[PDB]
């Protein structure tokens, strides 16, 4: 019931300069999590719906501190605009705003696919409101507040 490293690491420096050992993947029993896969985390603050992010760099510092750098997704409720009318279920807005967190705060691996792929996948199972599959709806920048659709269309 914990996340452990998987595979040989590589030593490097910098990245807020000090020394660390960067790994490529973590494992929790049956579950695997490689760099590039999307993961739902364990959130507790004021953000509305669960934080979901893409892993960019896993490392361990001196003292066995497991740190994961995450590029954040954004639910429609977390933007400066509310859930757009007819936005869709399980919509995620891509962002290029990243930060570091603890590796053990990862709830479970998830998938982020296109809208048509999302609707083709979620066609049968009656238990639809899950937390394992989401669809990309566009790009959101928290610094500017601007957000565009999955086709490059800014909104108001």
Curated annotation (Swiss-Prot):
Cysteine disulfide links: none
Domain of life assignment: Eukaryota
Domain BAH per the UniProt entry, residue ranges: 31-151
Signal peptide positions (record): none
Record's protein name: BAH and coiled-coil domain-containing protein 1
Source organism: Mus musculus
Lineage: Eukaryota, Metazoa, Chordata, Craniata, Vertebrata
GN (gene name): Bahcc1
């Amino acid at each position: 019931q914990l996340w452990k490293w998987s595979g040989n690491p590589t030593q490097r420096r910098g990245m807020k300069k000090a020394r660390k050992l960067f790994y490529k993947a973590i494992v929790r029993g049956k579950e695997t999590l490689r760099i590039g896969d999307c993961a739902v985390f364990l959130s507790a603050g004021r953000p509305n719906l669960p934080y979901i992010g893409r892993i960019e760099s896993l490392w361990e510092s001196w003292g066995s501190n497991m740190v994961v750098k995450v590029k954040w997704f954004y639910h429609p409720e977390e933007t400066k605009l509310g859930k757009r009318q007819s936005d869709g279920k399980n919509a995620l807005y891509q962002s290029c705003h990243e930060d570091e967190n603890d590796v053990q705060t990862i709830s479970h691996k998830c998938q982020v696919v296109g809208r048509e792929q999302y609707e083709q996948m979620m066609r049968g199972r009656k238990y639809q409101d899950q937390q394992d599959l989401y669809y990309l709806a566009g790009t959101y920048d928290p610094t500017t507040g601007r957000l565009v659709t999955a086709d490059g269309v800014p909104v108001l």
